[PDB]
Amino acid sequence: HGEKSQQAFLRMRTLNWYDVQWSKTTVNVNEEMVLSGKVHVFSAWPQAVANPRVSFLNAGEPGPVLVRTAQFIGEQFAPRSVSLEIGKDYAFSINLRGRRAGRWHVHAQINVEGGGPIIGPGQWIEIKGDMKDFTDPVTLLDGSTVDLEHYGISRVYAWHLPWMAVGAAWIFFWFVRKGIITSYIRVAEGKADDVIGDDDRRIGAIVLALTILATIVGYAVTNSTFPRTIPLQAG
Amino acid sequence: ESVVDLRGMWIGLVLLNVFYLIVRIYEQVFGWRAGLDSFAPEFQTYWMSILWTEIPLELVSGLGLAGYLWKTRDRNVDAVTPREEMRRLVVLVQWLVVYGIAIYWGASFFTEQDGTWHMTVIRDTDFTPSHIIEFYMSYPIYSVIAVGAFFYAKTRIPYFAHGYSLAFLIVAIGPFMIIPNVWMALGVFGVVLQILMRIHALVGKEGVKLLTE
Amino acid sequence: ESVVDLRGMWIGLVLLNVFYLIVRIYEQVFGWRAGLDSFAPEFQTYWMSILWTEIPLELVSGLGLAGYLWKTRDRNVDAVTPREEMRRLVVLVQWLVVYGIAIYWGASFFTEQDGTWHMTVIRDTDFTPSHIIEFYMSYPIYSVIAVGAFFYAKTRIPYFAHGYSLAFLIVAIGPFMIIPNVGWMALGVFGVVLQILMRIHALVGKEGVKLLTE
Amino acid sequence: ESVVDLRGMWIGLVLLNVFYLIVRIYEQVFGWRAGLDSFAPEFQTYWMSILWTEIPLELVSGLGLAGYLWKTRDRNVDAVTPREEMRRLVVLVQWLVVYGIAIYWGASFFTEQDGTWHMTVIRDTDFTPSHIIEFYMSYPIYSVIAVGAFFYAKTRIPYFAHGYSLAFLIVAIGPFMIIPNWMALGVFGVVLQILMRIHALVGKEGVKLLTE
Amino acid sequence: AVGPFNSVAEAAGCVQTVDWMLLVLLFFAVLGGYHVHFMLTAGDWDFWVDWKDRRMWPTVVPILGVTFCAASQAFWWVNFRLPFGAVFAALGLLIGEWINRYVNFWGWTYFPISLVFPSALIVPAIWLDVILLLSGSYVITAVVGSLGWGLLFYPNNWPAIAAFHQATEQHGQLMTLADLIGFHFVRTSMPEYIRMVERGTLRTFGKDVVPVAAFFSGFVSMMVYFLWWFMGRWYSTTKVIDTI
Amino acid sequence: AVGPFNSVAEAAGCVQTVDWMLLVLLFFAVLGGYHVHFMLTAGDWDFWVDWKDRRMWPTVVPILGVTFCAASQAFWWVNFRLPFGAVFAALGLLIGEWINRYVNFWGWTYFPISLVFPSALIVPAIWLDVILLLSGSYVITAVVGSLGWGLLFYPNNWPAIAAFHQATEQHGQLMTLADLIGFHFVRTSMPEYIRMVERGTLRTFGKDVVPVAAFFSGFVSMMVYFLWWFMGRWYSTTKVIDTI
Ligand SMILES: CCCCCCCCCCCCCCCCCC(=O)O[C@@H](COC(=O)CCCCCCCCCCCCCCC)COP(=O)(O)OC[C@H](O)CO
Ligand SMILES: CCCCCCCCCCCCCCCCCC(=O)O[C@@H](COC(=O)CCCCCCCCCCCCCCC)COP(=O)(O)OC[C@H](O)CO
Ligand SMILES: CCCCCCCCCCCCCCCCCC(=O)O[C@@H](COC(=O)CCCCCCCCCCCCCCC)COP(=O)(O)OC[C@H](O)CO
Ligand SMILES: CCCCCCCCCCCCCCCCCC(=O)O[C@@H](COC(=O)CCCCCCCCCCCCCCC)COP(=O)(O)OC[C@H](O)CO
Ligand SMILES: [Cu+2]
Ligand SMILES: [Cu+2]
Ligand SMILES: [Cu+2]
Ligand SMILES: [Cu+2]
Structure with missing residues (x-):
């Protein structure tokens, strides 16, 4: 949710997010969903942010309300850090599974090692059920x-x-x-x-x-x- | 009369554990849905209210507790009798017991708690829920109590009344240098040795060598 | 006779401010066009002349001032009377006032000046105009004066005559470790004036003291 | 009787120089072709045999030397006479002489030797031939001796019997903090302590007069 | 009658309740001080199952751990000959961590306790304390005490950690349970790259990663112990000064 | 007659001229030491209007600034109860810089004063001195004294700095007058990359750049103040030793 406070010019001139999509916007405890989309690594990357040579795909989400089950970017399974080249586009997706009942706002997120969190589009995702039931x-x-x-x-x-x-x-x-x-x-x-x-x-x-x-x-x-x-x- | 009263300790312990329990319980409730977007107006009404309240209120409690104890200071402190000193030392240990608990909450509980809230946000500011409680509440609170205990001893115990116990000085001022990096105040080691010296002396050669053996 | 003379101070202050004023003015003149190419023969005749002159000349002044003051040392310094000591302290404060000024020139003026000359050249060597003045003149100068003050006190004042004032020792040898970086600070004048102030306090009677100055 | 004996020192000096010569000569032989592949079974038989031998053996010599010297400690140490003290001091200097030689081998010879072996292997382990001798032999050996000399002083010389000489403590415990990465020039303060006692045990006559 | 106590009951009764108030107030106290220090430096490897590696963790933790155990011994032992300095500090920490992991990491933010359990120190702490009891010397403790302290870290932790080092295949890649837990229960601010865990080198020769790091922590802990023992002394100062 | 002075005139007159000589000699003196120290460290941000940014400058200057103020207080106040140590130091620096900027940066090398004017310290210097006067304590000065010193740094500079933060468009780009001044008046060795000024980060949240910097300098100045106070004391040593 932090994105508003982040510096405007850095938010525009780093990752450019498109085609972001949430499999569902309501889900039961234990039921799957995928967050997916594409991203374009801006060609004039700002000094202030380290080269995205070392980065990490993430679900921007208030703690494990949804468990991540797998994720993928650049056509690889990405449980560890990945390189993004400046200028290129990558497609990604994250398989989330509902855990904690409520109305959470779930983002696509990439963190660069030199630089910090870059927050993509987020979407409300209702979860129904009782966390006792989650496995x-x-x-x-x-x-x-x-x-x-x-x-x-x-x-x-x-x-x-x-x-x-x-x-x-x-x-x-x-x-x-x-x-x-x-x-x-x-x-x-x-x-x-x-x-x-x-x-x-x-x-x-x-x-x-x-x-x-x-x-x-x-x-x-x-x-x-x-x-x-x-x-x-x-x- | 009574060397050991303890009612004051209990009062403080109860009034503290209870207060924090409220605070912890409250942050369970207004942490999730209230304390996630710091740009929403619900943040102002549930979290920034606390920040604006506690800081001026803490600064007044601090100087208040301060002045009050200087004013009611024992103006003829060297005259104090062995039974009245022994009582005062036990009130000092009371103050310190409350200090311990305030240190536990401020330096353990709300400090390591912030560790987990960082994994739950990307932060719209440095006034998050946890920072509001940790840096601006639990910390100032144990800081006030440190000063209290220091001035009690300063204004009621002759050993503390003339000169400044270095250990105690470090204990009471230490706090205001914990705000960088965010030394350590194990200065309570020396303060309890200072209390233990007085106790040793105030017990006669009889209570001492003989009775406790 | 006269506890406070001051002529010596004036002499030094004048002979210093004047000398540096020349030097600053001269570097205005032979800074631009003379001190920009260190491979030109005009550099030798206007700037490298100074470097070759000052160093040997400063080392002789230093040992000169040293030996002379040891030689004219009061061989029976404990006998000094309260009026004669009070005079000698006032001469020592004079020495220090000159030291203050020499420090101002060496450590402020010609030091921060080099900051601006760096934005005016890309440097053919480390003997630029400014370095010639700063490291090799203004600094040795204040260094000699610190030694002088130190030896005056050592050889004229009983307090300073046996043992070594630590704050003074640092003040006079500090200088020779300012040459590192580039590449501690000598606020040891603090202790020296307090040592002077102690002597003054004692030499003024219980009367001048408690009573007169209140 | 005799204030200066020296037979003990000779014994030690001979028994050490000789031992290390053997060791050095031996590593010439089994260093090349024996100590280059630490995964070969010849490594076990010519290098790992030494490691497994020396460590337990050193630990026993160290506590042995210690206990023995405590047990034969002089129980009435202040009674010691000027000629008997003088003798014991000279035995203490003997211990220290041996210390110096064991420091020479451990901290000069086998330490800088490893510098050259590193240029002759890429290393299968940290138990190389040089490390086996350097860290696990020569070092423990001079450490044992340091302790010996410390206890000798402690159990035979009054000055050393009560209190702990700081220098000597640092000298004898120093060693056990060489394994990280201070230095033990603590021998400076120990010889000055020895020299004070000698000064005092020589009369105003021996002193001011005789040696002038 | 034993002035300033009216009776022998008033005497022994007072002693007994001031004894409790000291124990408690000193118990935390050191915990508050120990926790903040530890939490700030040794982190971080203690918060997260997926940082509890073979190299960094059994290195930074023993070394940063021993600090207040050393200061706390300087205090209990010198002044009271009470042989629980190290355990007094280590237990303080364990409780303050556990309370927090449970009440907050989990109770507040819902991380599983398998993600967020603390490192185990009590066994190393005991070794440290008994070495100080048996030998009566802080020099010996500094040497063999703090060596055992480092060696015993990983073994006394193994039982708690081994379950999570079982292997699993995910999307064609090997992962430990520990990696997966990390991965599943999303942290907003914990990218895999930040970890500071062993990642391999052309100078590991074995098979030897743990015992080298164990001994390394052991030897370094000797220096830190010395320095912290003497700081325990400085902190135990009863010097009164004269102005501010 | 008041020996060793012949008269009451000779006493009072000698006292009055030695008073002047001490002031002056100590005035610079501390200026020379203050300037060199400061110049070598805080540079550099002080020399150049295009380093006077929102993050680096209001951090390094307060922090490096307070040093000689703290020491100067330790001397003036302890031994003379004179409440002007900070202002004695901060004014000396300002004079020594201004003289130089004018006589040299400009007088010699022709950089406009707008490029090379120094940072303003006199307000924070005062706050520091008065906190020592009101409270009588270096501990309170160390805390609320050095905190005000920090906080007041940017505000007491703003008046001098705001002119140059007016916007201009050069060749399609936005520039401050300050960038443009630096740009126009060519320095041989001052590449724009060398600056060390705020260039943005993914962790700034606001709008908060100056306030966090000001507080950060405040809190860090407390520590430096302590250290430099005590060093003021050490330097005030009157110890006489016996050999070299
Ligand atoms: C040179 C300095 C001048 C500057 C002036 C500013 C002064 C600075 C600060 C001064 C603070 C000194 C505090 C020490 C005195 C304690 C007095 C008191 O209130 O405690 C009572 C008892 O003390 C207690 O038992 C304390 C037990 C521990 C708990 C105390 C603190 C409770 C705090 C609870 C938490 C609430 C949070 C508040 C903080 C925000 C009274 O005991 P007594 O022995 O003086 O006399 C008893 C009777 O009147 C005679 O028959
Ligand atoms: C002067 C540079 C070195 C020259 C090279 C070697 C020759 C040595 C010349 C030594 C003369 C220096 C002055 C020392 C004379 C006595 C000390 C003195 O200065 O104080 C007198 C008057 O007081 C002064 O005014 C103090 C000097 C004021 C401080 C100024 C320092 C000199 C300035 C040097 C500037 C050099 C740079 C010039 C630019 C190139 C009073 O003398 P007295 O009280 O010691 O006599 C008692 C003695 O026992 C009897 O024999
Ligand atoms: C079936 C075989 C079983 C083997 C059993 C042996 C197991 C070994 C156990 C270890 C026991 C330790 C015994 C060490 C005794 C040391 C002797 C001594 O302290 O020094 C004497 C002599 O000291 C010397 O000067 C020696 C100085 C040099 C020290 C050399 C140490 C040994 C060097 C070799 C190191 C090991 C490497 C060798 C190669 C393997 C002087 O003694 P004193 O003055 O108190 O006695 C009074 C005297 O009798 C009457 O006046
Ligand atoms: C796998 C790693 C192995 C590491 C093992 C290293 C162990 C060495 C620990 C470092 C400490 C050595 C030096 C300790 C100081 C001397 C101890 C002492 O003071 O002697 C006491 C005597 O008691 C004993 O210790 C008897 C000797 C046997 C105990 C052995 C402990 C010394 C360690 C030597 C072993 C060396 C092994 C090296 C092999 C690698 C004195 O008794 P006292 O206080 O009653 O006498 C009064 C005094 O004169 C006035 O204060
Ligand atoms: Cu959101
Ligand atoms: Cu935080
Ligand atoms: Cu230069
Ligand atoms: Cu090696």
Whole structure:
């Protein structure tokens, strides 16, 4: 929606948008739609904006009200950054799938690396349904399906919360077994060794052994589930 | 009488958590549909109203809290007795507890929140909903409270009354240099050591070495 | 006799403002037509003459002024009386007033002047007219004077006679590190006047002090 | 008895120069044809054997040297007599001499050597022959010695027994921050500390008079 | 009677409630300070599943992380001999992030928690804290403490991350789940090119990307720890000055 | 008689001439140092009417401007409670520049004064000095003093600058009088590309160019003020050392 505030001359002399089109203007949660169109890379590209040698096609939209399912520009599937030549035209399209019920204003968007967002035409797109109902899903290479809306989130919590709880336990442990004030005082008076002697060190030595162990284990296990993973695909 | 009262803390904690809860809840409501087009007149009525309100109102609360505490300053501060000092230190820790919570909201919650609103707009201005709350509300608020706590100690505690605690100076003025990049104020480390020194002294050789061991 | 003389100051101020006035006027004349082609033989006779003259002449003035002031140093400086010290401080303030003016010419006038000569040439060398004046004259000049002030105080005032005033040290050696960029600042005069002001305060009795000036 | 022994230094100097000579001679031999393909099995048998040997072996020598010297520490160190102190100082200088040689090999010889090996490979890993010797051998070795000399001082010389000489701390811990990319010319302050003690242990007579 | 306390109950009762108020107020406090610092520098790799790469992330995070863990230890340990400096700071951060990811990224803007979960620090923090307990030295902690801190980052995170590194084919291209999540749930201002994740080089030799970055973060964290330990000291200053 | 002065006339007369000598000697002095520093950094935008843009100039000048004002205050105010440090500095600079622009840029090389007139600092200098006078504090000056200094920079310049922002059409193009002045009066080494003035961006939103720049300079001047205040102090050192 920002476009109005953007500098007039930069908006005219960069991307020139034509034939923009919205498959639909109303859609149910889970129902697809395509935003599509063409764009002309102005031949006298302004100094202020880096060469569009590194750019990215996007759905100008207030968060994931519609999930992008695929997109294409210059006749390629474009999940990563693309080059636009100055002077040429490109055609693009973005497959959106409804997620959040409401009346959203959905734009075609391209960001240039040196320069920032360039906002194309947008259109109101009503979405009907209840986000509870929204799913993906998505097929892994091993053939199985997963719903991305929820996939993995349990395992995250299962790892994070126990650790935060362990973290809290340890803080509370020391804060109780020794005071803040008592400890300050003891240290300030001279001892110091009244606050910490082994077997406070025994307790630490054991908690650390338990921690390392729990780390090795949790590593190995997650290695058995999921024994074939790839690095993020970038470039 | 009572060394530990706490009613003032509770008042502040309740009056703060509650206020922010309203604010957060409100931004859920007028964030979506109200705070997306900053050129629409609904932006003026739901977001720019807050900006125009809070800034003058915060600047008055700041100087207000300021003057008031200088005026009611203890004019004979060195005369303060061990029980009355011990009470005042505990009111100072109260002020600081409220400071902590204001720092939590301003520096954690509404700060990292702006991170997610940036992924939800392309921005018509720098007065977005999140910036209005973050830079111009939550930040000034914890800044006011920092000054409060500083002047309390300045005007009620002899240690703080003559000279300036450097840690506390940094804590209260630090804030006005957080507006660049958008140093850190862990200066509370030194202020609680300063409070802990007084406590150590005000407890007798008996309370100390003997009682708490 | 006379605590405040000033003739020395006047002498220096006159002998300076006049000299630079000549130089500025001369560069108006031999700037245009004489100082535009550094490969012409008119450049040698009007501009490179100056460079070859001033440097050896400045290095001799500098060591000259130095040695002379060490030699005529008060060998029994702690004995100096309150009236004789008060005189010597006033001579030191004189030295500094001249230093101020030499700094004005070197560091403002001929320095920002080079800014405009750069928009008037594409440069055959780094010995242009302006660089000849700026780096190799106006700068060494104020540098010599800083050394002079420093040595006057060192050899006439007991405060400055044992130990080294840090602010003065920076003031007199600062200069030799202004030659980097291009390619710190010597506001160390701040501490020097405060050191002078301390002496004044003490030499005025409890009477002149608290009472008279109030 | 004897204030200057020196047999300990010789032992160390001989045992080091010799060892490194072997190492250098060895890398002449197995550098060419053995250490050019890190994916060949000859690399495992002639270069990765050393890496796997030296690291555990260095870590044990380091803690060994440490513990031993703490255990044989002088438990009544202030009682030490001027002739006994003088002797221990001269042993400390011996430790430091060895330190200097181990610094020479580690930070001069095998460090600038790697500069030339980089011009002779395009590298299958960061465990090249030169890196194996440089980072994982010569460096840990002079690091072990630094610690030795530090503990010797700590456990035999009163001045070093109480408090920590800053210079010596920096000298002995410095090493473990050479692995990033400051420099440890902290030996300056340690020899001045040694020189102060020598000054004091020589009487007003030895001093002002005898050496003049 | 133990003046300025009327009774022994009034004494120990007061101590006990000021103990709570300190713990709490210091707990955040450092969290506010830690979060803003971290969020400003280490970003960004912490917000987004599709930046949690093998090179940049296990490098900038341990190094930018250790800062307030070091300062916080300088505080708890020196003054109170309390061995929870690192965990005090790390936990503070984790909570302030989690609250936010949950209440705001998700509750407000509807990004899935699989997009926006934080990095895991508690395990490295424990190592840091126990090394300071066992050895009693910040020099040792600076060395072995901060080395373990860096090594343990990626392993203590793996369990949370591995699920998203499963492979999927989309329109003829390989993608990770993590890439796809990124891609599906549209961010207005996150073009793929901005990422700052590993993209390959003619000097990677392996297979070695993670353990090199792990050790790199470990060694660099030693310097940052030193510098932040001593800043913890400066911040703990009780110097009173005389004017402004 | 008031030794070491013979009379009350000789006392008061000597005091009165040394007062003049100090003022003057310190007046320039700080001018020489202020000018060189400023000239080397803030250049350059100060020399040329066609650099006096809406973004760079009202940023770099306030920020680089406040330095010697802060130091000059640290000296005049601490030791003499005299409230003119900023104005002492800002006026010295202006005089040293004006003399030069006139005697040299124009007098020597014949650039019109409209090309080469300096930036106006005296208003912001005053605001800075009075905030130090009213509050007695460098901390408050540092904050609200340097913020006003920032904000007032463009306004106190506008009167001098507006003439040249009148539009003209040359050969089918729009130009300001300021561009055209630079264009007409040929500088050997000043290619239009070298400028460093605002040329637009996809993130300007407004209409807001000058106000954001003014505030940005304001906020950044606070930090510089602090730093330069304390350096004013360092330079005011009366320490005597013992060897070289
Ligand atoms: C050289 C300076 C001169 C310039 C003049 C300007 C002055 C600048 C700023 C001065 C501010 C100093 C604040 C310190 C004094 C605190 C006094 C007070 O109001 O607190 C009460 C109690 O304090 C509390 O318990 C505080 C608990 C923590 C909460 C306090 C702040 C709550 C803020 C809540 C959030 C609302 C948001 C406001 C900000 C926008 C009173 O305690 P008492 O001990 O003085 O006396 C009690 C009785 O009268 C005697 O029987
Ligand atoms: C002068 C350049 C160097 C010349 C080359 C070597 C020859 C050295 C010549 C040394 C003469 C310099 C003046 C030093 C004489 C005494 C210091 C003096 O200047 O103060 C006197 C009067 O006060 C003055 O007016 C101070 C000088 C004012 C500052 C002006 C500096 C000189 C200006 C130089 C301009 C050079 C550039 C000209 C253009 C090319 C009073 O002298 P006294 O109080 O030290 O006597 C006590 C002594 O113990 C007895 O022997
Ligand atoms: C079946 C075989 C099992 C092998 C078991 C061995 C395992 C190794 C464990 C490591 C134990 C460490 C032992 C090191 C002892 C050092 C001795 C000492 O500190 O120095 C003495 C001598 O010190 C010297 O001067 C030595 C200076 C040079 C140091 C050289 C260090 C070794 C150099 C080699 C480095 C390693 C590389 C070699 C090649 C492999 C002086 O001692 P003192 O003055 O306190 O004693 C009093 C004296 O007895 C009566 O007056
Ligand atoms: C895979 C990577 C490996 C990295 C491993 C590196 C480990 C080295 C860590 C760097 C710190 C070394 C220097 C530490 C300072 C000396 C410690 C000390 O002060 O000695 C104490 C003695 O206790 C001991 O430490 C006994 C020695 C055994 C412990 C070993 C710790 C030193 C590390 C040496 C291992 C080197 C391994 C190198 C191989 C790569 C003193 O006891 P005290 O305080 O009671 O005495 C009072 C004092 O005189 C007055 O204050
Ligand atoms: Cu829109
Ligand atoms: Cu923001
Ligand atoms: Cu030049
Ligand atoms: Cu190498």
